[PDB]
Design a protein around this ligand. Structure first.
Ligand SMILES: COCCn1cc(Br)cn1
Length: 119
């Protein structure tokens, strides 16, 4: 029932993601010189360095907010891919599967802890 435990659990999960080769295209903002029309397609760019910085700045109140930003990395990849067989999109699908598998217990534990706090 530790209401704060999600933060370190999210830092460790972000460390795992950074070690994964599939995270390479998503570790820093999409390069607008490389993809000049990116902002015509994507309204809200997001990447794992921005997620890690928001977390370290104390600017996420819950793991749900972190999860919404991480999911935005994956939905941006899906929206910008010209094909469902592209390299970067294929990497995003595996990384999303890994992320969802690991974040489930973090979300569950946090929601359980908050319900106990207000019991
Ligand atoms: C890392 O992303 C670079 C921009 N982009 C390429 C595809 Br495919 C999807 N998004």
């Amino acid at each position: 029932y530790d209401i704060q435990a999600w933060k370190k659990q999210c830092e460790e999960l972000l460390n795992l993601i950074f070690q994964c080769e599939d995270s390479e295209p998503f570790r820093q903002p999409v390069d607008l010189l490389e993809y000049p029309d990116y902002r015509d397609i994507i309204d809200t760019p997001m990447d794992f360095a921005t997620v890690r910085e928001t977390l370290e700045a104390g600017n996420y109140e819950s793991p749900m907010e972190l999860c919404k930003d991480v999911r935005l990395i994956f939905s941006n990849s899906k929206a910008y891919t010209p094909s469902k067989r592209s390299r970067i999109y294929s990497m995003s699908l595996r990384l999303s599967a890994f992320f969802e598998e690991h974040i489930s217990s973090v979300l569950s534990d946090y929601k359980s802890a908050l319900r106990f706090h207000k019991r």
